[PDB]
């Protein structure tokens, strides 16, 4: 991404930083 | 692979850019 890693809930939070819309990226829930 | 590509490391946002489908 840019500095944080992408494992655990860090990857999901990174998807929101990319687009930001719900049901737009991988949303495990 | 995108997540497993650098899950235990820091690759680049250019990979996650393909997660807005």
UniProtKB/Swiss-Prot annotation, chain B:
Disulfide pairings: 6-11
Organism: Homo sapiens
Protein name stated in the entry: Insulin A chain
Segment of the intact protein contained: 90 to 110 of 110
